[PDB]
């Protein structure tokens, strides 16, 4: 039941799909806010960067965040505030040479995988308005339902 891919785009999805998005590049890969409580982009950091200062255009605003990975896989830092005054903290990084970033809205929270594969792991995290949140993708993705989440889990850790 995976459906895709489809080209970048903003929509806001229903409850219970999980979004997998095939990040081709370095940069923003998706920047999700309800613009209340609840602001997550994903900045794909290449293999073996050493510590540094890189600027990225997230929610209209220019930031800048000190990355680095020192392993030979892809790293997807999750960069998350609660508030609009609040900076973004890297809240979880997923690392993977797989290049695929999944997103769910299910049971009134945001499901992300984060870990390092194949290995990776599904975590929450709470909003106040769930309905609320959209999402921007910055690279082609795919859609699967909730119910094949096994499936899902396979293709995050294993790939397409």
Request: proline share 5%; charged share 20%.
């Amino acid at each position: 039941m995976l459906d895709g891919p489809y080209q970048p785009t903003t929509f806001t999805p229903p409850s219970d799909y999980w979004i997998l998005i095939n990040s081709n590049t370095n940069g923003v890969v998706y920047e999700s806010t309800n613009n209340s409580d609840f602001w997550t982009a994903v900045i794909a950091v290449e293999p073996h960067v050493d510590p540094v200062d890189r600027q990225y255009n997230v929610f209209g605003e220019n930031k800048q965040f000190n990355v680095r990975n020192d392993s030979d896989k892809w790293k997807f830092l999750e960069m998350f505030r609660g508030s609009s005054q609040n900076d973004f903290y890297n809240r979880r990084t997923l690392t993977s040479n797989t290049r695929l970033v999944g997103i769910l809205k299910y049971g009134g929270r945001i499901w992300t995988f984060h870990g390092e594969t194949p290995r990776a792991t599904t975590d929450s995290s709470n909003t106040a308005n769930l309905n609320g949140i959209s999402i921007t993708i910055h690279s082609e993705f795919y859609i699967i339902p909730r119910s094949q989440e096994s499936k899902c889990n396979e293709y995050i850790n294993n790939g397409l």
